[PDB]
Structures are given as C-alpha cells and as structure tokens.
Amino acid sequence: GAMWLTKLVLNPASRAARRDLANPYEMHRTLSKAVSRALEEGRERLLWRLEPARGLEPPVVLVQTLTEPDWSVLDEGYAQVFPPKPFHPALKPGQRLRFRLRANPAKRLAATGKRVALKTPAEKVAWLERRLEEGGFRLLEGERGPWVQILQDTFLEVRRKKDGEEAGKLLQVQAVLFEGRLEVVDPERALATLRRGVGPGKALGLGLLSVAP
RNA sequence: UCCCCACGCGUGUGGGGA
C-alpha cells in the first residue's frame, strides 16, 4: 500500500485551532474529518503528533494516514497546510534511522486488571524496546547504553470525571517523547509497525512513530 | 488516567476509544 504525511501549521488566531489545541478529543475530530470515509470503512489508522514548540513558532501538527486525506474540509483560516506527501517507506535490513515517538508506556496490572503507566525511565525505555523489537526494529546501542533519550515526560489533559454537578477528578495520560536511533531488522514488519503506530493514545496524539536518517 | 473488545499455566499481551 501507500502512506500519507501532512504538515499542519495551526493559526493561533483561529478559535477552532485553539479549541483543538486545548482538547485532544476536538483535535481528533477535526483531523478525522480529512479521512472520514476511509475511517468509517476501516481502511484508516489516523496518527498524529503535536510538535514541541520552538518558542514564537506556530504550533505544528504532524499527521499520518494510510489513505489520501482531504484538508479542504478544514475551516480557513485554520492552518497553513502544504499539500500532503505520498509516503513509501523504503526499509532495508540494517538500515539505521532516527525516530521520534510520543507514547504512553504501559502495562495491565495482572493484580488489579487495570492499565497503568510505567513509572521509571528504565521501565519506560524497556517498554519502548520491547515494542520496537516485536515490531521489526531494534534500538541502536551506543558505547554506553541504548541510543535513545527521553526528551520529555509530561501529563496530557484528556477529560474530567463526570461528578454530580461538581467538577470531579481530571483524567490524563502520561506522555513520553522518546528520541533516538534504531535499525530495521524485518522491513515488512517494521512497515506494519509504522502503519499501525505504537501503544495507547492514538486518539489523543500519541503512538506516532516517525523515522528518518 | 477512566471505559470497551479480543486473548493468557508468563507478578500479563494486543486492538479501539474518550
């Protein structure tokens, strides 16, 4: 098949841009409207990442789709958007690549049955590693440890626990931006993995594994 | 976080979503 990458530069003057900036559910709904049909028909895995700001630079949202998106669904002036690019990962064994992944390292407690965030850099890096290896990739290892860094570890505001007429607890996920390098071990599998994304929260702008030299 | 589904002789796994 083929893939698509789209760069949205959001207008901080746009109330809708800001609406979606503030709420992943919104952003998800806005984005989802570019690949609606394929979405309905099970032909689409929407994936996106909101890039960390370089200061006065506009917020920038990277989006991957299995199918051709139509951004004419966007209100203007929502975002300066450049024509989507057809994507065709040329993966070969041994090929080394840089990667960026905002994710939610997690496990299900066999004890409680509940899905919980891992707590330590170690556990978080181990998770990312299990996930990459099962996914046809392999972390590169420098002279001291894995060639991988946690650029940020923050909480992502999701939604509020409905409480009777009073504001309840906040629901949020732990979002971990990994950056590093890795090599392809099984091309086709690595492609599956890239087309699917990695771990929970795809609906909130997690799971998008990007790769390039 | 909070929920749902699919599995598990492994101190759990994978998929979706708000």
PDB file of C-alpha atoms (C1' of nucleotides) in Angstrom:
ATOM      1  CA  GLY A   1       0.000   0.000   0.000  1.00  0.00           C
ATOM      2  CA  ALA A   2       0.979   3.666   0.358  1.00  0.00           C
ATOM      3  CA  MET A   3       1.032   6.222   3.174  1.00  0.00           C
ATOM      4  CA  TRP A   4       0.462   9.942   3.731  1.00  0.00           C
ATOM      5  CA  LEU A   5       2.119  12.639   5.792  1.00  0.00           C
ATOM      6  CA  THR A   6       0.607  16.025   6.296  1.00  0.00           C
ATOM      7  CA  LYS A   7       2.004  19.072   7.965  1.00  0.00           C
ATOM      8  CA  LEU A   8      -0.480  21.454   9.538  1.00  0.00           C
ATOM      9  CA  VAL A   9       0.729  24.740  10.868  1.00  0.00           C
ATOM     10  CA  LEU A  10      -2.071  25.876  13.085  1.00  0.00           C
ATOM     11  CA  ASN A  11      -3.188  29.510  13.286  1.00  0.00           C
ATOM     12  CA  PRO A  12      -3.090  30.586  16.974  1.00  0.00           C
ATOM     13  CA  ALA A  13      -5.554  33.290  15.945  1.00  0.00           C
ATOM     14  CA  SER A  14      -8.067  30.578  14.961  1.00  0.00           C
ATOM     15  CA  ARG A  15     -10.558  29.796  17.734  1.00  0.00           C
ATOM     16  CA  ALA A  16     -11.009  26.304  16.275  1.00  0.00           C
ATOM     17  CA  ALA A  17      -7.216  25.852  16.110  1.00  0.00           C
ATOM     18  CA  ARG A  18      -7.094  26.830  19.765  1.00  0.00           C
ATOM     19  CA  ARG A  19     -10.145  24.720  20.616  1.00  0.00           C
ATOM     20  CA  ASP A  20      -8.322  21.657  19.268  1.00  0.00           C
ATOM     21  CA  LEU A  21      -5.034  22.801  20.752  1.00  0.00           C
ATOM     22  CA  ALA A  22      -6.701  22.664  24.159  1.00  0.00           C
ATOM     23  CA  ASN A  23      -8.582  19.360  23.753  1.00  0.00           C
ATOM     24  CA  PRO A  24      -7.303  16.146  22.062  1.00  0.00           C
ATOM     25  CA  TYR A  25     -10.847  14.949  21.517  1.00  0.00           C
ATOM     26  CA  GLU A  26     -11.554  18.014  19.411  1.00  0.00           C
ATOM     27  CA  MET A  27      -8.258  17.862  17.515  1.00  0.00           C
ATOM     28  CA  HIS A  28      -9.018  14.212  16.860  1.00  0.00           C
ATOM     29  CA  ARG A  29     -12.450  15.072  15.480  1.00  0.00           C
ATOM     30  CA  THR A  30     -11.132  17.897  13.326  1.00  0.00           C
ATOM     31  CA  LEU A  31      -8.350  15.725  11.899  1.00  0.00           C
ATOM     32  CA  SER A  32     -10.639  12.715  11.476  1.00  0.00           C
ATOM     33  CA  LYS A  33     -12.685  14.824   9.089  1.00  0.00           C
ATOM     34  CA  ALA A  34      -9.934  14.657   6.462  1.00  0.00           C
ATOM     35  CA  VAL A  35     -10.161  10.907   6.126  1.00  0.00           C
ATOM     36  CA  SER A  36     -13.812  10.370   7.152  1.00  0.00           C
ATOM     37  CA  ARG A  37     -14.960   7.778   4.672  1.00  0.00           C
ATOM     38  CA  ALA A  38     -11.863   5.562   4.895  1.00  0.00           C
ATOM     39  CA  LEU A  39     -12.191   5.912   8.646  1.00  0.00           C
ATOM     40  CA  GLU A  40     -15.781   4.611   8.592  1.00  0.00           C
ATOM     41  CA  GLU A  41     -14.827   1.759   6.299  1.00  0.00           C
ATOM     42  CA  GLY A  42     -11.969   0.508   8.471  1.00  0.00           C
ATOM     43  CA  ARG A  43      -9.366   1.455   5.886  1.00  0.00           C
ATOM     44  CA  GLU A  44      -7.668   4.122   8.011  1.00  0.00           C
ATOM     45  CA  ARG A  45      -5.405   4.452  11.073  1.00  0.00           C
ATOM     46  CA  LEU A  46      -5.210   8.142  11.883  1.00  0.00           C
ATOM     47  CA  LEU A  47      -1.998   9.063  13.746  1.00  0.00           C
ATOM     48  CA  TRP A  48      -0.672  12.434  14.761  1.00  0.00           C
ATOM     49  CA  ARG A  49       1.843  14.290  16.837  1.00  0.00           C
ATOM     50  CA  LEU A  50       1.796  17.853  18.061  1.00  0.00           C
ATOM     51  CA  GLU A  51       5.366  19.080  17.808  1.00  0.00           C
ATOM     52  CA  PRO A  52       7.129  20.663  20.782  1.00  0.00           C
ATOM     53  CA  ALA A  53       7.350  24.443  20.300  1.00  0.00           C
ATOM     54  CA  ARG A  54      10.490  26.303  19.300  1.00  0.00           C
ATOM     55  CA  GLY A  55       9.149  29.401  21.012  1.00  0.00           C
ATOM     56  CA  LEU A  56       7.452  32.016  18.868  1.00  0.00           C
ATOM     57  CA  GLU A  57       6.947  29.434  16.133  1.00  0.00           C
ATOM     58  CA  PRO A  58       3.321  28.464  15.389  1.00  0.00           C
ATOM     59  CA  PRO A  59       2.155  25.090  16.722  1.00  0.00           C
ATOM     60  CA  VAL A  60       2.782  22.436  14.119  1.00  0.00           C
ATOM     61  CA  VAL A  61       0.865  19.177  13.846  1.00  0.00           C
ATOM     62  CA  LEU A  62       2.195  16.195  12.000  1.00  0.00           C
ATOM     63  CA  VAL A  63      -0.304  13.670  10.730  1.00  0.00           C
ATOM     64  CA  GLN A  64      -0.033  10.297   9.118  1.00  0.00           C
ATOM     65  CA  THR A  65      -2.797   8.498   7.238  1.00  0.00           C
ATOM     66  CA  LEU A  66      -2.912   5.252   5.316  1.00  0.00           C
ATOM     67  CA  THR A  67      -5.193   6.942   2.723  1.00  0.00           C
ATOM     68  CA  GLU A  68      -5.221  10.226   0.846  1.00  0.00           C
ATOM     69  CA  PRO A  69      -6.519  12.994   3.154  1.00  0.00           C
ATOM     70  CA  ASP A  70      -8.646  15.950   2.018  1.00  0.00           C
ATOM     71  CA  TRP A  71      -7.828  19.074   4.022  1.00  0.00           C
ATOM     72  CA  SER A  72     -10.329  21.177   2.140  1.00  0.00           C
ATOM     73  CA  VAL A  73     -12.574  20.061   5.000  1.00  0.00           C
ATOM     74  CA  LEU A  74     -10.632  22.469   7.212  1.00  0.00           C
ATOM     75  CA  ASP A  75     -12.123  25.823   8.038  1.00  0.00           C
ATOM     76  CA  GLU A  76      -9.942  28.666   6.813  1.00  0.00           C
ATOM     77  CA  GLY A  77      -8.060  30.190   8.260  1.00  0.00           C
ATOM     78  CA  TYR A  78      -7.401  27.154  10.409  1.00  0.00           C
ATOM     79  CA  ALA A  79      -3.951  26.251   9.211  1.00  0.00           C
ATOM     80  CA  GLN A  80      -1.343  26.865   6.592  1.00  0.00           C
ATOM     81  CA  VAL A  81      -1.178  23.365   5.194  1.00  0.00           C
ATOM     82  CA  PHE A  82       1.087  22.167   2.450  1.00  0.00           C
ATOM     83  CA  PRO A  83      -0.096  19.524   0.013  1.00  0.00           C
ATOM     84  CA  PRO A  84       0.126  16.082   1.700  1.00  0.00           C
ATOM     85  CA  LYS A  85       3.053  13.881   0.654  1.00  0.00           C
ATOM     86  CA  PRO A  86       2.652  10.282  -0.537  1.00  0.00           C
ATOM     87  CA  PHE A  87       4.744   8.140   1.734  1.00  0.00           C
ATOM     88  CA  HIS A  88       6.526   4.934   0.750  1.00  0.00           C
ATOM     89  CA  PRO A  89       8.956   3.739   3.432  1.00  0.00           C
ATOM     90  CA  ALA A  90      11.918   2.073   1.737  1.00  0.00           C
ATOM     91  CA  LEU A  91      13.009  -0.230   4.548  1.00  0.00           C
ATOM     92  CA  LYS A  92      16.074  -2.495   4.319  1.00  0.00           C
ATOM     93  CA  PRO A  93      17.705  -4.715   6.993  1.00  0.00           C
ATOM     94  CA  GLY A  94      20.463  -2.976   8.939  1.00  0.00           C
ATOM     95  CA  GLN A  95      19.288   0.421   7.734  1.00  0.00           C
ATOM     96  CA  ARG A  96      19.787   2.930  10.506  1.00  0.00           C
ATOM     97  CA  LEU A  97      17.187   5.620  11.192  1.00  0.00           C
ATOM     98  CA  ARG A  98      16.412   8.383  13.628  1.00  0.00           C
ATOM     99  CA  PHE A  99      12.994   8.243  15.268  1.00  0.00           C
ATOM    100  CA  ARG A 100      10.604  10.324  17.287  1.00  0.00           C
ATOM    101  CA  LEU A 101       7.722   8.862  19.288  1.00  0.00           C
ATOM    102  CA  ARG A 102       5.316  10.437  21.734  1.00  0.00           C
ATOM    103  CA  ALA A 103       3.841   7.482  23.570  1.00  0.00           C
ATOM    104  CA  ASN A 104       2.286   6.048  26.713  1.00  0.00           C
ATOM    105  CA  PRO A 105       4.468   3.204  28.010  1.00  0.00           C
ATOM    106  CA  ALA A 106       2.058   0.933  29.858  1.00  0.00           C
ATOM    107  CA  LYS A 107       1.131  -2.437  31.277  1.00  0.00           C
ATOM    108  CA  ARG A 108      -2.001  -4.107  32.609  1.00  0.00           C
ATOM    109  CA  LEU A 109      -1.666  -4.990  36.281  1.00  0.00           C
ATOM    110  CA  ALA A 110      -2.478  -8.680  36.499  1.00  0.00           C
ATOM    111  CA  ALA A 111      -3.270  -7.857  40.110  1.00  0.00           C
ATOM    112  CA  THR A 112      -5.950  -5.160  39.543  1.00  0.00           C
ATOM    113  CA  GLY A 113      -6.677  -5.758  35.871  1.00  0.00           C
ATOM    114  CA  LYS A 114      -6.178  -2.026  35.326  1.00  0.00           C
ATOM    115  CA  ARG A 115      -3.902  -0.478  32.667  1.00  0.00           C
ATOM    116  CA  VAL A 116      -1.219   1.653  34.420  1.00  0.00           C
ATOM    117  CA  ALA A 117       1.581   3.976  33.387  1.00  0.00           C
ATOM    118  CA  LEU A 118       5.108   2.671  33.992  1.00  0.00           C
ATOM    119  CA  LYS A 119       6.955   4.912  36.406  1.00  0.00           C
ATOM    120  CA  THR A 120      10.746   4.678  35.834  1.00  0.00           C
ATOM    121  CA  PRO A 121      12.877   5.759  32.828  1.00  0.00           C
ATOM    122  CA  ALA A 122      14.139   2.235  32.881  1.00  0.00           C
ATOM    123  CA  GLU A 123      10.661   0.709  32.632  1.00  0.00           C
ATOM    124  CA  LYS A 124       9.720   3.283  30.033  1.00  0.00           C
ATOM    125  CA  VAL A 125      12.792   2.550  27.924  1.00  0.00           C
ATOM    126  CA  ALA A 126      12.312  -1.174  28.342  1.00  0.00           C
ATOM    127  CA  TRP A 127       8.741  -0.855  27.126  1.00  0.00           C
ATOM    128  CA  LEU A 128       9.772   1.131  24.023  1.00  0.00           C
ATOM    129  CA  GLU A 129      12.417  -1.553  23.391  1.00  0.00           C
ATOM    130  CA  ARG A 130      10.047  -4.494  23.738  1.00  0.00           C
ATOM    131  CA  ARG A 131       7.678  -2.670  21.432  1.00  0.00           C
ATOM    132  CA  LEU A 132      10.322  -1.891  18.805  1.00  0.00           C
ATOM    133  CA  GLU A 133      11.775  -5.403  18.797  1.00  0.00           C
ATOM    134  CA  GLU A 134       8.431  -7.113  18.492  1.00  0.00           C
ATOM    135  CA  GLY A 135       7.795  -4.617  15.706  1.00  0.00           C
ATOM    136  CA  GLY A 136      10.659  -5.491  13.386  1.00  0.00           C
ATOM    137  CA  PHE A 137      13.010  -2.772  14.591  1.00  0.00           C
ATOM    138  CA  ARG A 138      15.887  -2.714  17.040  1.00  0.00           C
ATOM    139  CA  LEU A 139      17.289   0.043  19.183  1.00  0.00           C
ATOM    140  CA  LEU A 140      20.857   1.140  18.324  1.00  0.00           C
ATOM    141  CA  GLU A 141      23.240   0.906  21.213  1.00  0.00           C
ATOM    142  CA  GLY A 142      25.968   3.471  21.782  1.00  0.00           C
ATOM    143  CA  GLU A 143      29.143   2.797  23.757  1.00  0.00           C
ATOM    144  CA  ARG A 144      27.197   3.414  26.970  1.00  0.00           C
ATOM    145  CA  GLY A 145      23.614   2.185  26.890  1.00  0.00           C
ATOM    146  CA  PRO A 146      20.791   2.441  24.321  1.00  0.00           C
ATOM    147  CA  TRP A 147      20.943   5.179  21.741  1.00  0.00           C
ATOM    148  CA  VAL A 148      17.701   6.724  22.935  1.00  0.00           C
ATOM    149  CA  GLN A 149      16.648   9.724  25.012  1.00  0.00           C
ATOM    150  CA  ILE A 150      13.534  10.844  26.835  1.00  0.00           C
ATOM    151  CA  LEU A 151      13.164  14.432  25.591  1.00  0.00           C
ATOM    152  CA  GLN A 152      10.092  14.998  27.725  1.00  0.00           C
ATOM    153  CA  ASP A 153       7.789  13.320  30.202  1.00  0.00           C
ATOM    154  CA  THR A 154       4.602  15.256  30.812  1.00  0.00           C
ATOM    155  CA  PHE A 155       0.910  14.719  31.510  1.00  0.00           C
ATOM    156  CA  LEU A 156      -1.705  15.123  28.807  1.00  0.00           C
ATOM    157  CA  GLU A 157      -5.021  16.639  29.872  1.00  0.00           C
ATOM    158  CA  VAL A 158      -7.780  14.451  28.441  1.00  0.00           C
ATOM    159  CA  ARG A 159     -11.137  14.896  30.181  1.00  0.00           C
ATOM    160  CA  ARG A 160     -12.878  15.289  33.548  1.00  0.00           C
ATOM    161  CA  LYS A 161     -14.588  12.575  35.554  1.00  0.00           C
ATOM    162  CA  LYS A 162     -18.267  13.470  35.465  1.00  0.00           C
ATOM    163  CA  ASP A 163     -19.277  14.195  39.034  1.00  0.00           C
ATOM    164  CA  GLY A 164     -22.630  15.228  40.267  1.00  0.00           C
ATOM    165  CA  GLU A 165     -22.920  18.899  39.363  1.00  0.00           C
ATOM    166  CA  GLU A 166     -19.392  19.384  40.741  1.00  0.00           C
ATOM    167  CA  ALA A 167     -16.104  19.233  38.847  1.00  0.00           C
ATOM    168  CA  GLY A 168     -14.502  15.842  39.568  1.00  0.00           C
ATOM    169  CA  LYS A 169     -11.057  14.310  39.071  1.00  0.00           C
ATOM    170  CA  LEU A 170      -9.059  15.063  35.947  1.00  0.00           C
ATOM    171  CA  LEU A 171      -8.242  12.261  33.550  1.00  0.00           C
ATOM    172  CA  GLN A 172      -4.842  12.435  31.916  1.00  0.00           C
ATOM    173  CA  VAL A 173      -2.233  10.222  30.364  1.00  0.00           C
ATOM    174  CA  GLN A 174       1.489  10.227  30.827  1.00  0.00           C
ATOM    175  CA  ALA A 175       3.044  11.302  27.546  1.00  0.00           C
ATOM    176  CA  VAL A 176       6.642  10.400  26.891  1.00  0.00           C
ATOM    177  CA  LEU A 177       8.598  11.868  23.978  1.00  0.00           C
ATOM    178  CA  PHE A 178      11.362   9.449  23.014  1.00  0.00           C
ATOM    179  CA  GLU A 179      14.049  10.413  20.507  1.00  0.00           C
ATOM    180  CA  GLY A 180      16.867   8.109  19.346  1.00  0.00           C
ATOM    181  CA  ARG A 181      18.152   5.809  16.623  1.00  0.00           C
ATOM    182  CA  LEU A 182      17.439   2.300  15.625  1.00  0.00           C
ATOM    183  CA  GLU A 183      17.840  -0.116  12.743  1.00  0.00           C
ATOM    184  CA  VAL A 184      15.496  -2.167  10.609  1.00  0.00           C
ATOM    185  CA  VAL A 185      15.501  -5.890  11.268  1.00  0.00           C
ATOM    186  CA  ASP A 186      12.389  -7.043   9.439  1.00  0.00           C
ATOM    187  CA  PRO A 187      11.388  -4.486   6.766  1.00  0.00           C
ATOM    188  CA  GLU A 188       7.818  -5.617   6.126  1.00  0.00           C
ATOM    189  CA  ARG A 189       7.096  -5.920   9.836  1.00  0.00           C
ATOM    190  CA  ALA A 190       8.664  -2.530  10.524  1.00  0.00           C
ATOM    191  CA  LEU A 191       6.260  -1.226   7.884  1.00  0.00           C
ATOM    192  CA  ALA A 192       3.279  -2.872   9.609  1.00  0.00           C
ATOM    193  CA  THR A 193       4.515  -1.276  12.800  1.00  0.00           C
ATOM    194  CA  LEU A 194       4.813   2.185  11.229  1.00  0.00           C
ATOM    195  CA  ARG A 195       1.398   1.934   9.598  1.00  0.00           C
ATOM    196  CA  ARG A 196      -0.226   0.883  12.914  1.00  0.00           C
ATOM    197  CA  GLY A 197       1.605   3.218  15.314  1.00  0.00           C
ATOM    198  CA  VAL A 198       2.841   2.304  18.781  1.00  0.00           C
ATOM    199  CA  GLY A 199       0.989   1.838  22.075  1.00  0.00           C
ATOM    200  CA  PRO A 200      -2.040   3.594  23.572  1.00  0.00           C
ATOM    201  CA  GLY A 201      -3.471   7.046  22.982  1.00  0.00           C
ATOM    202  CA  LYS A 202      -3.532   7.220  19.225  1.00  0.00           C
ATOM    203  CA  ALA A 203      -6.826   9.060  19.785  1.00  0.00           C
ATOM    204  CA  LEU A 204      -5.005  11.799  21.751  1.00  0.00           C
ATOM    205  CA  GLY A 205      -1.916  12.279  19.569  1.00  0.00           C
ATOM    206  CA  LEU A 206       0.228   9.514  20.933  1.00  0.00           C
ATOM    207  CA  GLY A 207       1.628   6.476  19.137  1.00  0.00           C
ATOM    208  CA  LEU A 208       3.003   8.121  16.032  1.00  0.00           C
ATOM    209  CA  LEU A 209       6.436   6.548  15.347  1.00  0.00           C
ATOM    210  CA  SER A 210       8.340   8.686  12.836  1.00  0.00           C
ATOM    211  CA  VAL A 211      11.604   7.573  11.215  1.00  0.00           C
ATOM    212  CA  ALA A 212      14.317   9.152   9.001  1.00  0.00           C
ATOM    213  CA  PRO A 213      18.156   9.134   8.549  1.00  0.00           C
TER     214      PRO A 213
ATOM    215  C1'   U B   1      -5.511   8.081  33.855  1.00  0.00           C
ATOM    216  C1'   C B   2     -11.189   6.223  33.006  1.00  0.00           C
ATOM    217  C1'   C B   3     -14.065   2.604  29.640  1.00  0.00           C
ATOM    218  C1'   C B   4     -14.650  -1.303  25.872  1.00  0.00           C
ATOM    219  C1'   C B   5     -13.138  -5.901  22.964  1.00  0.00           C
ATOM    220  C1'   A B   6     -10.048  -9.812  21.780  1.00  0.00           C
ATOM    221  C1'   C B   7      -6.621 -13.315  24.348  1.00  0.00           C
ATOM    222  C1'   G B   8      -3.305 -15.566  28.813  1.00  0.00           C
ATOM    223  C1'   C B   9      -0.321 -22.105  33.296  1.00  0.00           C
ATOM    224  C1'   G B  10       4.113 -15.889  31.911  1.00  0.00           C
ATOM    225  C1'   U B  11       3.705 -10.974  39.006  1.00  0.00           C
ATOM    226  C1'   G B  12       0.126 -10.142  31.688  1.00  0.00           C
ATOM    227  C1'   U B  13      -0.436  -9.102  25.860  1.00  0.00           C
ATOM    228  C1'   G B  14      -2.596  -6.812  21.872  1.00  0.00           C
ATOM    229  C1'   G B  15      -6.503  -3.566  19.454  1.00  0.00           C
ATOM    230  C1'   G B  16     -10.154   0.839  19.922  1.00  0.00           C
ATOM    231  C1'   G B  17     -11.996   4.918  22.158  1.00  0.00           C
ATOM    232  C1'   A B  18     -12.709   9.486  25.464  1.00  0.00           C
TER     233        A B  18
END
